[PDB]
């Protein structure tokens, strides 16, 4: 029915009524996500001189860009960032290490 895995471009999974596609190399992407990837590849190729390829496995890709662009963009809630108590403790320790390196002339300062 609906794919159980993750889209590697946006890092979200697939939900009911979302628009997604499956490549000939067996990889699933939201339609919107693959469209964006292809646009960038087309730009880079032109600036050097097809070579549009799957982001996962590098297999040359067949596609229709307009069809992919027409699909609805998934509405996906942003994942909040709430550092755990342990993470906050770890960040404080890093601050101390950085300070010592500065004193040693061990930090590159490009100014």
């Amino acid at each position: 029915n609906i794919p159980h895995g993750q889209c590697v471009i946006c890092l979200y999974g697939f939900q009911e009524k979302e628009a997604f596609t499956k490549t000939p190399c067996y990889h699933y992407f939201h339609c919107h996500c693959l469209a964006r990837a292809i646009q960038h590849m087309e730009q880079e190729l032109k600036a050097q001189g097809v070579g549009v390829q799957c982001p996962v496995c590098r297999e040359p890709l067949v596609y229709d860009l307009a069809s992919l662009k027409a699909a609805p963009e998934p509405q996906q809630p942003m994942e909040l960032y709430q550092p755990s108590a342990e993470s906050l403790r770890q960040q404080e320790e890093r601050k101390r290490l950085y300070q010592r390196q500065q004193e040693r002339g061990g930090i590159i300062d490009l100014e």
Binding site: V8, I9, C10, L11, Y12, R36, A37, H40, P55, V56, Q76, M78, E79, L80, Y81, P83, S84, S87, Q90, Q91, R94, L97, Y98, Q101, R104, G105, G106, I107, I108, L110
Partner: protein, 146 residues
């Protein structure tokens, strides 16, 4: 870019690559600091190395800019902290992640690529006198990163 950046941040908090950390500098989600503990298979063992990460507007479709902040003696990293590494330029893909980039740099520290150097004298020494090379790399680690 921002939703993708939040996803990565949460994954790197749950399950970061061995010996590494990464998170935002202050309030700015597009500028991160990372750390690498010197790999046990390298002359950087025991040191902690800070790096800077800047995400471009079109991330993840263009690569992050990654440089060393901690001084390091290596044929592929210069005195400005610039890193010569394929996946940071010609070989980037939107399937890659910061977690994967950190894993790649760890590998480069263990095994340099002397034939594509940023520092010709260090490359000459690496190729002609590895004993001298590892000695100097350890000496810089001890002075600056420990």
């Amino acid at each position: 870019a921002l939703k993708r950046i939040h996803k990565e941040l949460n994954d790197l908090a749950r399950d970061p690559p061995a010996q590494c950390s990464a998170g935002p500098v202050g309030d700015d989600m597009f500028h991160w600091q990372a750390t690498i503990m010197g790999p046990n298979d390298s002359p950087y063992q025991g040191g902690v190395f800070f790096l800077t990460i800047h995400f471009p507007t079109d991330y993840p479709f263009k690569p992050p800019k990654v440089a060393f902040t901690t001084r390091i003696y290596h044929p592929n990293i210069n005195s400005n902290g610039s890193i010569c590494l394929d996946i940071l330029r010609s070989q980037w893909s939107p399937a890659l992640t910061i977690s994967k980039v950190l894993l790649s740099i760890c590998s480069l520290l263990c095994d340099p690529n002397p034939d594509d150097p940023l520092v010709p004298e260090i490359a000459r020494i690496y190729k002609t006198d590895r004993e001298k090379y590892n000695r100097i790399a350890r000496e810089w680690t001890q002075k600056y990163a420990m």
